[PDB]
Amino acid sequence: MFLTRSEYDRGVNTFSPEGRLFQVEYAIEAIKLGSTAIGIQTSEGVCLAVEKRITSPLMEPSSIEKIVEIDAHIGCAMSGLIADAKTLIDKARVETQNHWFTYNETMTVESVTQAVSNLALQFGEEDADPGAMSRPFGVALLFGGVDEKGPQLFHMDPSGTFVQCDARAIGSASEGAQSSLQEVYHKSMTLKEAIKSSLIILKQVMEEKLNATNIELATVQPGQNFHMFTKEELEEVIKDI
Amino acid sequence: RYDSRTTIFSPEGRLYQVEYAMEAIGHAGTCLGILANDGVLLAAERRNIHKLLDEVFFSEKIYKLNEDMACSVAGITSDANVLTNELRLIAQRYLLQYQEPIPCEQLVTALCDIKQAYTQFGGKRPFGVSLLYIGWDKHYGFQLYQSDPSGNYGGWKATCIGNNSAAAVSMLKQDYKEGEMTLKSALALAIKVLNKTMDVSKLSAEKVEIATLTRENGKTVIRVLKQKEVEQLIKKHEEEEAKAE
Amino acid sequence: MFVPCGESAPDLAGFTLLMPAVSVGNVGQLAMDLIISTLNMSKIGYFYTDCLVPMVGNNPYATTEGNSTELSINAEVYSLPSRKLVALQLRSIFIKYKSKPFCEKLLSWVKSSGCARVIVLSSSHSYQRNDLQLRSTPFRYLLTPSMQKSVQNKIKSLNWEEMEKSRCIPEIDDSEFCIRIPGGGITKTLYDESCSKEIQMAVLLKFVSEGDNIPDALGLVEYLNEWLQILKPLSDDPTVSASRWKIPSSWRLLFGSGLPPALF
Amino acid sequence: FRNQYDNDVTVWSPQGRIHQIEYAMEAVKQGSATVGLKSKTHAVLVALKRAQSELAAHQKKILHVDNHIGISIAGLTADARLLCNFMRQECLDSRFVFDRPLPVSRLVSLIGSKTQIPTQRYGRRPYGVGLLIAGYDDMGPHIFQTCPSANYFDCRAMSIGARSQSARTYLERHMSEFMECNLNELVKHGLRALRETLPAEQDLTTKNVSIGIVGKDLEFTIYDDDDVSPFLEGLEER
Amino acid sequence: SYDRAITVFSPDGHLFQVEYAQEAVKKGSTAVGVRGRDIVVLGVEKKSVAKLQDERTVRKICALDDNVCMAFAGLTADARIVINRARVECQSHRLTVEDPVTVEYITRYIASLKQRYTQSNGRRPFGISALIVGFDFDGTPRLYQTDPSGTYHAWKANAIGRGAKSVREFLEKNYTDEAIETDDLTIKLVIKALLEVVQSGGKNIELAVMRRDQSLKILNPEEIEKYVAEIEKEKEENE
Amino acid sequence: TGYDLSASTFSPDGRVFQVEYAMKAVENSSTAIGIRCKDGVVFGVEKLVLSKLYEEGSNKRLFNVDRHVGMAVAGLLADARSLADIAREEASNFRSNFGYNIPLKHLADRVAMYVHAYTLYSAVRPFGCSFMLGSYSVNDGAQLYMIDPSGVSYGYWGCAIGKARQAAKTEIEKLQMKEMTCRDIVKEVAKIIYIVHDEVKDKAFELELSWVGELTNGRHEIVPKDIREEAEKYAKESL
Amino acid sequence: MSRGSSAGFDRHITIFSPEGRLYQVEYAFKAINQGGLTSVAVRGKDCAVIVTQKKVPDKLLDSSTVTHLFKITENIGCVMTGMTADSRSQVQRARYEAANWKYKYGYEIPVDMLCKRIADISQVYTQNAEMRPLGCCMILIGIDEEQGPQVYKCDPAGYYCGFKATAAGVKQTESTSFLEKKVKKKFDWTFEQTVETAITCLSTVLSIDFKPSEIEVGVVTVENPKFRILTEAEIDAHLVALAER
Amino acid sequence: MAATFFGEVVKAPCRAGTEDEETPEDREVRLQLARKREVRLLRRQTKTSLEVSLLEKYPCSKFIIAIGNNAVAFLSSFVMNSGVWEEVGCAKLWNEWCRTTDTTHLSSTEAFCVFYHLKSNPSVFLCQCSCYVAEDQQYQWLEKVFGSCPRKNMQITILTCRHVTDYKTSESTGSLPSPFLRALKTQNFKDSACCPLLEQPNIVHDLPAAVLSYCQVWKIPAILYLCYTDVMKLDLITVEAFKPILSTRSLKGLVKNIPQSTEILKKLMTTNEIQSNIYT
């Protein structure tokens, strides 16, 4: 008989019929704007590639901070409101160092991502006055690293959820990249061909030419600790497209 | 997007609550200050024209903040009282720390910080008071300062806040002997300005609150002008405009 | 803009039109839901425009098993050719930035058929009301200038209360007394538009805040019956047969669907 | 005609009814089917892992809580992980103070109170996750299921999550013969109950079933992937 | 789903009061910063000359420490607050990690302060963008740019405020090796860039520069007026 | 309408609607009767078996709040259980401070004011349940008190709360409860419960009894089972 | 934070009407009438008496424990009218405040000071943003030492005043008229031209004669200054004294 | 929603949406944004030039259109298996959802209002849309697809899925045997449906409602089918709730081989997006 406006996506802590926090899954809608990131976790190691999307030549490429070192054995990729990524990464680094301090050991990747998720999920509890978010974060993360269980990769999005994923792409073209991934991905991947295939997909989903400055990627494998790729090695691996 | 909460940016960048705060100023009594080579004056229109009022004591819009510098107000007079009290307290605090009278910019900035803190984290009405500061310090000599409810401020050589502010400032821009005027030449200029910004009512000493600041013998003097001096200044300007015919 | 059910023009030569406005609490739409149900008014035409968000239902006025499959859309026009009564029903809400095209397309149609009156049942916010309305009755009325010479004596013999007129530009103190009805939806924009067209319209509205507006709906329809006597005036003491009004078939469960079997 | 009343949890509908709680129920219907039947000696939790992503390891329905208490979540992951931490804290404190395993039937009451507190205050939302608690204590197995309505029930078998009505019907049809079952038959019954929820085109593979058992002498042990081959094998076709 | 109440994501995710403080710096005075080989330049226009105003108090080129100097655009009061906080932070860092603070560190601190006023429905965002420039202890020039959101991308030559892309996209085609080799050569770059959007001449075009290890030195209309001296530097040697 | 979104709001005719929805909320739950007789008070509820999967004893509604005090609720199970927990703390506090058991008339006033204290604030919402406190002591005999969601506390000879309180009250009025013992009252309680119960909509309920009084040494107890079956039968042949 | 000030002239407590009248306070006054009960209090020069209805719309209810006459302290008693829960809460507040006064000042609180304290507490509710006025009005009585017998009345607005004889409830205005005609006419009211006055007022305004089960009487006299609730017999005695002539 | 700080006025929302507040910078930005939110038919490989409505250019006899991802899966498997379907084009839509130029290389396992017609008989058209069309684009969409001169020799069948929580019945929704099927027909749709008609309080309000209403006004026979399912994402039995539809005359000429459609359902369900894992 009658149709009415009915707003349940405005305030946090509000359940729509079908029982879902629209407010949080709007923060999921925010990742759709950040740069595309690819993480491939092979038995030989794990690599993290990401487009950088420089706006103007006057911008220093090294300033754009899309892959960070949580510790010597955890690498992270950002996508979304990097203003939030800066506090999440700070939490991750502080937690890893606290764990190493208390427990004379290297913190496993799963526990790192679990602690970072613990920083999330404090969306609305403003009765707890000190320094809450009052909102979900706006960033989706890709924790890559090596630990007792071999190399592992984890994806977490602004819902406090993680999975021991591998070949998970996040960013504006995340689902198209994932569609390419599953049919390109394989269990027995040498780290070289993992980087190869990842850069091929990142190629097709780009704006600009692909060169050493448009993207930048890092790998961790049991051999060496966290390792960025320089302008040198980026050109060195893109000679062959 | 609209006029609420004093903590929302409209979809066009403009803090509408503060823009409305700088609207109550456009209704209070006209207040102007002029900087001269040898002193500073701070004239104001005392709009309590009702005859049953008493207690002409030293002020209704011209407060004294410390041994050196004085203040004037415009807008919601209760918030002006709160701000003047806070200014006096800040000046005394600085004097307590460094055992020297506070430089005028120090106090002006200290107050503007509070006034801006109310146009930010809050949920409370921003202070709808625009002030004027006159004072001295060894660092720059005579100084004049303005303030808005926005927390903004600036040093002015000659300004005016309140009713008819635009015409007063236009006349002051076109009328000022910038950098080479004495004191009561600026007093004559101020009388001319107020004569520009009258209501229908011609001004008299019952409608003016001129106050002056002076650098003498190592001590700073803030004497509010009494009846006779003001009426004599008024006759002087009156004859001057008469022969200006 | 009108589209009929019988591929013909009903030819509303002088029919009086009763009109809703999408208003706070949907009180006008709900009241004319009542009048349509009670007068058993037949469905004669469709009002297809690109202004209403679309909606479909199955004859929300279904009185019999036979006609209960009768598809209905967001806007149809109902009528009673026997007693000079034609009613429009707007059920859904208005598309954004689209009240203009609907209003003058609709009044273009109204002028085309040569209808006499476009009486509108509306509603207004209960926090509009300053002290005067709080101490007064919750009903008001508006007459267009052509209404202002016609049944004028009836309205202010019936002891009614004129629309409150607020300052039209509160920035200045020199403006007129000017029309300001918020929560009227298209009430004001229809009224001033018809003033420009000089077309006979009446506007009868109640001050409301939303909730279960069934009491508000009977209040509005009895307010209408005070002037129209569409339904057999009260005679001061039925006092038992409170159901003088058809409750339409779609006036079933309103607050929701039902109680989950896990709480109480 | 109830749009004003279904936004905040501290607003009664004019029908004697809190719509927000009933909307918190609807989160449980968005998880995945999970079954918690029990026998005279043991209690099990069969859950179906989410095949909504691909190539990424499925989520972790069954959660360790203590040596004698385990849980299965069928709601918001945030609230689930927030409640499991509180559960672990309660069990740890109970063993710290009294040096005894916390009885299940008191931990469940503590859950009820803690989840009721937000249901009444402004600016909070009900815990949108439904639990399935398998435990063993001095009085043998228990299966408690929790709702977002801060209402806990003592169940001899229950299923919560998407399409769980099929599993509930099946369990209701086979509840009598649950008390006398060896562990094998109990797990097979639970697997069948989980199976009757799935579309007939897919079968319970080893990569989406997460049996976890506690009982008399067996600690709460979670059986993840391929390790659930012994339980899953021998399961007849539908 | 609207502009309203910062802590809300749009159905796309465009949490809007930050999107507006982002656009709040489109009405502030244009600011430009170009980083040279041995000099960092910092130029701001002042098209609010207001002749009877003491040019000293409205000054926008603030200093944060011996090695860091700051410009901004937008709401001046918020700028004063953040500048006070940044100065206190610089001194506090020199108190605990005793060294001159890196331009990186103070830029990150300012960005973090700006970001911290974006959660907590609470506060309103700062409505300014900053151009942190200076020399670091290892001896290299830096140039940074913050936003109300909290992003702190570091550039080589910048522009914020009114006429943002106008200045920036002029400055796309003019930054080169033969623009930072010599100092006054670097200076003339910023002057021309500002003249592209200037209010028709050196009307209080508040320029301040900084060479290595010495100080912030606000160039002022000297007896020579290096301001004008360079205005018709270019306006003579344009042909 | 419009005046019913918060407890801190009086309707124009002077009625706090958001406590009258709560008093109208309990009509969603099944009935609960408690009768006071010479020796003690006996409760009884039309406990609903939501499904056959539930254990015999889940969703109890006959909580013990102290040794000598009982409680039967109706309404939201969660809020009623929370109030039962709150009352359990009043009795403990009174015992710890004054040594002896808490008087029932005092306990019903300690808790009623609490339910009321949630009915005058905009932040919290009123409790959506009603309950009956029962007790017996040789000093003061048997007492029975009822607390509506509004916080009104009155003592009753016969009480009934739930979706069919009216029929239950009508049937209770047919006993001389002042002249009977619990042994003969339990039979009548079962009779009332089956008489008031509406079977058409609510098959598969579980009659649940409890008494406290002289014959149990003044300690609250669920009824020993064999008595429950004799009452079950007695209610059955009568029907 | 809180739900927020409901937007509207009559939506909320602290919001002011255009001619400056709090509305939720007056709706609180019209919330007294809920229940239908009315109360009357009169005083002679050596006794104060409060009389109220005892309407029990059921027979299951223990009539002994249903009441509206509460004893604040041993010398002070009150009758509450309005919504019951708020009435009993305010009785708790009164008892606590009266005990605290004796603790802090060493002598029994005079009736006026108690009524003033509770009026102060209740007014605070009319100023914040989620507290709500208690829809219940108090009528205290007592003898202090010398000030005389006193009958006071609070109200949700926070007002309180002295009364020679007062009333509250639904049938209140007519009771006020009858009681005014009473006081105009003859005012010894020793102990009998008392309570027959109150019972006669309550009846003549309400209905035909009461019978002892519907009336609840508490008295304080100068030579017996302790709140005594009259039993069912002596109330009936006064009832026949009405009938007996 | 409101009440950000203590004591703020809330201004309770209006269910009728009357709180809308009824200047070159606003007008020009209004023009450009309104230009953004446009549905544009594309004769692709020419990419443009459909000023005439698409159904006003080709003759139509039977029109089947599905709305919602479950419906598009149902059509793409059970219907789109037997024959051969050519692309007449697609519709380019941007709105609050389906962003970043939702039209792509067709991303083979994806569709967004893409139209197909049979190889043997081009007059039978199938619109395969899985995007949410906002209120401001639905009528423009109808005009572009249909036109104002509907050749009434065609028949139209529309299918969509709705969450079971929207159903209005006296008993609780957690008691209805979801999923269930209900049908809405115009008066000129002579056939009785294979599922019971939608009840009185219940309601349809989206693009499917727009299409059904447009068919209503112009006497066009049409049918609306609802799959009131308890899970809104892609799932098998939710789609298979549409199985009875495959039986009525309106589609009997298109269904030939079922097990092929079943294995297609399996594959497409296994090869869908990676929707965020929150448990919702």
Closest Cβ opposite residue H278 in set D25, D76, D202: D76
Q: Is F149 helix (H, G, I), strand (E, B) or coil?
A: coil
The torsion defined by the Cα of E104, E110, E114 and E117, in degrees rounded to 10, comes to 120
Map out the domains of chain B with their CATH numbers. Answer: 1-245 (3.60.20.10)
Distant-in-sequence contacts of A93-99, Cβ < 8 A, 24+ apart: A96/A70, A96/A71, A97/A71
Contact H230 D29 (CB under 8 A): yes
* B150, B154, B158 member nearest E58 (Cβ): B154
Strand partners, C222: none
| CA gap E70, E61 in Å, rounded | 6
Among the partner residues G29, G34, G85, nearest to F151 by beta-carbon distance: G85
Q: Is H9 helix (H, G, I), strand (E, B) or coil?
A: strand
Tokens of G39: 């109360």
Q: Find, among D154, D146, D130, D125, the residue nearest to D31 by Cα.
A: D130
Q: Domains in chain E and their CATH numbers?
A: 1-239 (3.60.20.10)
Token pair, residue B125, equals 């009405």
Angle at B232 between CA B226 and CA B235, to 5 degrees: 140
Rounded Cα distance between A229 and A45, Å, is 15
Measured torsion, CA atoms of residues D79, D85, D91, D96, in degrees rounded to the nearest 10: -150
Distance in angstroms (rounded) separating the CA atoms of residues H241 and C14:
52
Tokens matching residue B164: 């008819």
Pairing of strands B158-161, B219-224: unpaired
* Tokens 């709401």, residue located: E75
**Structure tokens that stand for A238 in this block:** 């893109």
G222 closest CA partner among G57, G63, G44, G52? G44
Residues in contact with F130: Cβ distance below 8 Å, sequence separation at least 6, in sequence order? F23, F26, F73, F74, F75, F146, F147, F148, F149, F161
User: What structural domains and CATH numbers belong to chain G?
Assistant: 2-245 (3.60.20.10)
Q: How far apart are CA C85 and CA B157, in angstroms?
A: 76
Q: Which of H186, H211, H168 is nearest to C69 (CA)?
A: H186
Q: Which of residues 162-201 of A touch E (CB under 8 A)?
A: none
Domains of chain D: 3-236 (3.60.20.10)
Asked if C96 and H16 come within 8 Å (Cβ–Cβ), the reply is no
The DSSP output letter for H17 is: -
Residues of chain C with C-beta less than 8 angstroms from the C-beta of D15: 255-256
Q: Which residues contact H138 (CB under 8 A, 6 or more apart)?
A: C53, C54, H206, H207, H210
Q: Are D33 and D161 in contact (CB under 8 A)?
A: yes
- CA dist., res. C29 & res. D57, Å (int): 54
Considering only CB atoms, E54 lies closest to which of B109, B116, B155, namely: B155
D43: enclosing H helix or E strand:
strand D43-47
Q: Which of B158, B142, B149 is nearest to B70 (CA)?
A: B142
Q: Which range marks the domain in which residue F103 is found?
A: 1-238
Amino acid at E232: E
DSSP letter string over E74-87? E-HHHHHHHHHHHH
C-beta separation of B72 from B212 below 8 A? no
| Whole-angstrom Cα Rg for chain H | 20
Say if residues H232 and H163 touch (Cβ distance below 8 Å): yes
Chain centre to alpha carbon of residue H43: 20
> Any chain D CB within 8 A of the CB of C258?
no
CATH of the domain at A128: 3.60.20.10
- The experimental technique used to determine this model is cryo-EM
Cα-based angle G180, G181, G182 (whole degrees, multiple of 5): 85
Task: Please answer yes or no on whether B122 and H5 come within 8 Å at the CB atom.
Answer: yes
**Measured between alpha carbons, how far is A8 from H36 in angstroms, rounded to an integer?**
26
Q: Structural domain of residue A173, as residue ranges?
A: 9-241
Q: Which candidate from B113, B154, B172 shows the least CB-CB separation from E57?
A: B154
**C134·G9 Cβ contact <8 A:** yes
Q: Are strands C85-90 and C56-58 parallel, antiparallel or unpaired?
A: unpaired
Report the C-alpha gap between B85 and H139 in whole angstroms: 64
Q: Alpha carbon H13 to chain centroid distance? A: 29
Which residue of B lies nearest to E74 if distances are taken between CA atoms?
B13
Report CB contact under 8 Å: E112, A86: yes
Instruction: Closest CB to E7: pick one of A57, A58, A135.
Output: A135
Interface test with D, best of F17, F26, F53 (most D CBs within 10 A): F53
Q: Enter the tokens of residue A171.
A: 């960013």
DSSP annotation of G76 reads: E
Amino acid (one-letter) located at G240: V
F76 chain-C contacts, CB cut-off 8 A? 263-264
Taking Cα atoms as reference points, which of F56, D70, D195 lies closest to residue D187?
A: D195
Of the candidates H175, F201, H200, D17, the residue with the CA atom closest to the CA atom of residue C252 = H200
Query: Measured between alpha carbons, how far is F49 from F51 in angstroms, rounded to an integer?
Result: 5
Identify whether H179 is preceded by a cis peptide bond (ω within 30 of 0): yes
Please, what sign has the CA dihedral across residues A20, A22, A23, A27? Answer: positive
Question: Would you call A83 and E15 a contact, using CB atoms and an 8 Å cutoff?
Answer: no
Going D36 to D39 to D44 to D50, the CA torsion angle's sign is negative
Query: Distance (Å) from the C-alpha of residue C264 to the closest C-alpha of chain D?
Result: 10
> Count of CB contacts below 8 A, D vs G?
5
DSSP element (H, E) containing A113: helix A109-119
Joined together, the tokens standing for residue D199 give 């579309």
CA E67 – CA E90 distance, rounded (Å) = 10
Name which of E158, E178, E56 is nearest E107 in CA terms.
E158
At a CB cut-off of 8 Å and minimum separation 6, what does D178 contact? D37, D38, D39, D156, D157, D186, D189
Q: F123 — contact with chain G (CB < 8 Å)?
A: yes
DSSP state of B202: P
DSSP state of E102: P
Chain breaks in chain A (C to N over 2.5 A) after: none
Q: How is residue F129 written in tokens?
A: 């349940």
Residue H45 falls in which region: left (phi positive, over 0), alpha (psi -120 to 50) or beta: left
SS3 string, chain H, reads CCCCCCCCECCCCCCCCCCCCCCHHHHHHHHHHHHHCCCEEEECCCCECCCCCHHHCCCCCEEEEEECHHHHHHHHHHHCCCCCEEEEEEEECCCCCCCCCCCCCCCCCCCCCEEEEECCCCCEEEEEECCCCCCCCHHHHHHHHCCCCCCCCCEEEEEEEEEHHHCCCCCCHHHCCCCEEEEEECCCCCCCCCCCECCCCCCECCHHHHHHHHHHHCCCCEEEEEEEECCCCCCHHHHHCCHHHHHCHHHCCCCCCHHHHHHHHHHHHHCCCCCCCCCC
CA angle H182, H183, H188 (to 5 degrees): 165
- Partner residue opposite F53 with nearest CB, options D11, D150, D172: D172
* CB D27, CB A17: distance < 8 Å: no
CA distances for A40 relative to A168, B131, G65, H96, angstroms: 7, 64, 76, 32
Based on the number of CB atoms within 10 Å of its own CB, is E124 exposed (0-12), middle (13-18) or buried (19 or more)? buried
SS3 content of chain F, % helix, strand, coil (to 5): 35, 25, 40
The residue with tokens 């692909």 is: A210
Contact call for H and G: 3+ CB–CB distances under 8 Å: yes
Instruction: Please report the sign of the dihedral spanned by the C-alpha atoms of residue C229, residue C231, residue C232, residue C238.
Output: negative
The residues near H107 (Cβ < 8 Å, ≥ 6 apart) are A176, A179
Alpha-carbon distance of E27 to E161, in angstroms, equals 6
Phi/psi at H276 (5° precision):
-55, 130
Distance set, CA H125 to CA F4, H120, H224, H236 (Å): 53, 12, 16, 25
How many other C-beta atoms lie within 10 A of the C-beta of residue A186? 12
CA distances from C45 to A33, C19, C94, H214, H224 (A): 48, 15, 20, 14, 22
Three-class SS of A145-179? EEECCEEEEEEEECCCEEECCCCEEECCCHHHHHH
* Residue B226: count of CB within 10 angstroms of its CB: 11
Burial class, F98, CB count within 10 angstroms (exposed 0-12 / middle 13-18 / buried 19+)? exposed
Q: Return d(Cα A168, Cα A163) in angstroms, integer.
A: 10
- DSSP H or E stretch at residue B113: helix B104-117
C-alpha to C-alpha distance for F212 and F138, rounded to whole angstroms: 12
D91 vs D97: CA distance, rounded Å: 10
Residue whose structure tokens are 């998970």: A168
Q: Is D7 part of the contact surface with chain A (CB cutoff 8 Å)?
A: yes
User: Do D10 and G1 lie within an 8 Å CB cutoff?
Assistant: no
Domain count, chain A: 1
Q: In this complex, do F150 and G59 lie within 8 Å of one another by their Cβ atoms?
A: no
Residue (of D156, D216, D224) closest to D182 by Cα position: D216
In the β-sheet with H114-118, what is the strand arrangement from edge to edge? H40-42, H85-92, H114-118, H124-129, H62-67, H155-163, H222-229, H180-185
Q: What ranges in D98-180 are assigned the alpha helix state H?
A: 104-116, 164-173
Q: Fill in the DSSP letter of residue H78.
A: I
Positive or negative, the CA dihedral A179, A184, A189, A194 is negative
Residue with tokens 């990842």: A198
Q: Would you call C260 helix, strand, or coil by DSSP?
A: coil
**Residue A185 lies inside a defined structural domain of this protein:** yes
How far apart are the C-alpha atoms of G66 and G55, rounded to whole Å?
9
Q: Which resolution, in Å, applies to this structure?
A: 3.4
Task: Report the C-alpha gap between A149 and A73 in whole angstroms.
Answer: 13
Contact G238, G63 (CB under 8 A): no
Which residues 171-210 of H have a C-beta within 8 angstroms of A? 200-201, 203, 205
**Do B111 and B147 touch, CB atoms closer than 8 A?**
yes
Reported as type and span, the H/E element at residue C225 is helix C214-228
Residue H128 pairs in a beta bridge with: H66, H114
Fill in the amino acid letter for G51: V
Tokens 């700073």 sit on residue: B220
Residue H29, token pair as written in the block: 């930005």
Q: Within a 10 A sphere around the Cβ of F214, how many other Cβ atoms?
A: 17
Judge contact between E73 and E30, C-beta under 8 A: yes
Cβ contact E17:A37 at 8 Å: no
Burial D9-45 (b: 16+ CB within 10 A, else e): bbbbbbbbbbbbbbbbbbbbbbbbbbbbbbbebbbbb
| F129, F19 contact by CB (below 8 A) | no
- Beta partners for residue A142, in sequence order: A77, A155
Closest CA to E188 of E172, E207, E169: E207
Mutate to test the interface with F, among D9, D120, D165 (most CBs of F within 10 A): D120
The one-character DSSP state at H79 is: I
Q: Which among A163, A218, A158, A164 is positioned nearest to A191, based on CA atoms?
A: A218
**Residues of chain G positioned with their CB less than 8 A from the CB of F6:** 3, 6, 130
How far is it, in rounded angstroms, from Cα C129 to Cα B78? 31
Q: Is E108 exposed, middle or buried (0-12, 13-18, 19+ CB in 10 A)?
A: middle
The answer to whether F20 and F192 have CB atoms below 8 angstroms apart is no
Please give the DSSP secondary-structure letter assigned to residue B201: S
Q: Six-digit token pair at E55?
A: 């040019």
End-to-end CA distance of chain E: 55
Tokens 């002539």 map to which residue?
A: G245
Contacts for E113 with CB less than 8 Å, ≥ 6 apart = E82, E85, E86, E126
